[PDB]
């Protein structure tokens, strides 16, 4: 069913990273890859590879975590601590170029879809465009 294909993805990722899983399968779309790209290019994921489950197209996403820690709760930090949908189907969110977000003072990325393609808070400010604002990650 899946009213939001994109949000569904970022949640499958969020949920795996929580359980520390090597990868997760996230049914495939062009625009979902273009976003899945920027996640490796900026280093939140090792990367993806197109694959097949039951003759059905998927994207396997390979998950990055931090080093084993010490003290109790000997569990890795997160490469993606935070991922959530900004503009969704229920309320769509478009920002002009002067209006683009600051995410985490610059410590993090804001993925945003524009006429020049899927760009990031910087890339878009550099091209000087803006567009629909997919989500935010740190």
């Amino acid at each position: 069913m899946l009213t939001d294909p994109i949000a569904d993805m970022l949640t499958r990722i969020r949920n795996a990273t929580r359980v520390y899983k090597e990868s997760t399968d996230v049914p495939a779309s062009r625009f979902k890859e273009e976003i899945l790209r920027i996640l490796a290019r900026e280093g939140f994921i090792k990367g993806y590879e197109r694959v097949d489950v039951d003759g059905k197209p998927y994207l396997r996403v390979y998950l990055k975590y931090g080093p084993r820690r010490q003290g109790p709760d000997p569990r890795p930090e997160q490469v993606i601590h935070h991922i959530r949908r900004i503009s969704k189907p229920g309320r769509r969110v478009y920002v002009g170029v002067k209006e683009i977000p600051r995410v985490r003072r610059g410590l993090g990325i804001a993925i945003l879809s524009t006429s020049k393609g899927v760009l990031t808070d910087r890339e878009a400010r550099k091209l000087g465009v803006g567009g629909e604002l997919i989500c935010e990650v740190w």
Binding site: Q70, G71, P72, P74
Partner: protein, 237 residues
């Protein structure tokens, strides 16, 4: 020399717990048959290898290992193998706090020395017929839980646990203190909180005597002069 083959690992060192598992134990598990999960012994190598690397490095800088198992299987194979190393150990019940509270539980060690002197001495017979039996009985059990803990009046940089689940207390006790934790862990528990992992049967004495035995050897070698086989087979099968 040090190592172990995968041949002597066959006494029965693969699997104990069937269906009783702790699924975080996936990586080290091979296949299920006849009940019990059979635990992969090739990884047990890659680990026993990397594990020993921390033990060998530790022993030759003069640091300590603290020995724990309370089971029926792992009891007598601790006392022996532990004294032969010269390391501390816990045989009977593991007193709560023994690490996060070393301070107050060790004040109970001093009382053990205070009881040893005064056994026969220029004091005792002057204390009435009641008190003697009393004090010596306080010595009896005192020596029981605290026999092997008596050594090492400072706290170690490692512990060695037979079943990481059977004392969960300990593993977390040390973990709270930054004290590294190494143990022999079957399907019972999760790799997770154990820092240096010995993925094999933690029951079936043949396995705990074999893996602890030649693991005590590796400690003497970084000290000096690894010695002839120490008591292992007693009532064994």
């Amino acid at each position: 020399e040090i190592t172990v083959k995968e041949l002597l690992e066959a006494g029965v060192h693969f699997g104990h717990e069937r269906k009783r598992w702790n699924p975080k134990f996936a990586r080290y598990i091979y296949a299920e048959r006849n009940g019990i999960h059979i635990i992969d012994l090739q990884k047990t190598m890659e680990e026993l290898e990397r594990t020993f690397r921390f033990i060998e490095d530790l022993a030759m800088r003069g640091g300590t290992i603290l020995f724990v198992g309370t089971k029926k299987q792992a009891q007598d194979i601790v006392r022996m193998e532990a004294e032969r190393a010269g390391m501390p150990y816990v045989n009977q019940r593991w007193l709560g706090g023994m690490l996060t509270n070393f301070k107050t539980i060790s004040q109970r060690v001093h009382r053990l020395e205070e009881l040893e002197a005064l056994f026969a001495s220029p004091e005792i017979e002057e204390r009435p017929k009641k008190e003697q039996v009393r004090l010596k009985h306080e010595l009896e059990r005192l020596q029981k839980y605290l026999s092997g803990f008596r050594l090492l009046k400072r706290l170690p940089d490692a512990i060695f646990v037979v079943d990481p689940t059977k004392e969960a207390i300990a593993v977390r006790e040390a973990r709270k203190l930054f004290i590294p934790v190494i143990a022999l862990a079957d399907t019972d528990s999760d790799p997770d909180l154990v820092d240096y992992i010995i993925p094999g049967n933690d029951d079936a004495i043949r396995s705990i005597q074999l893996i602890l035995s030649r693991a005590v050897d590796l400690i003497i070698q970084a000290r000096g002069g690894v010695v002839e086989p120490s008591p292992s087979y007693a009532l064994v099968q």
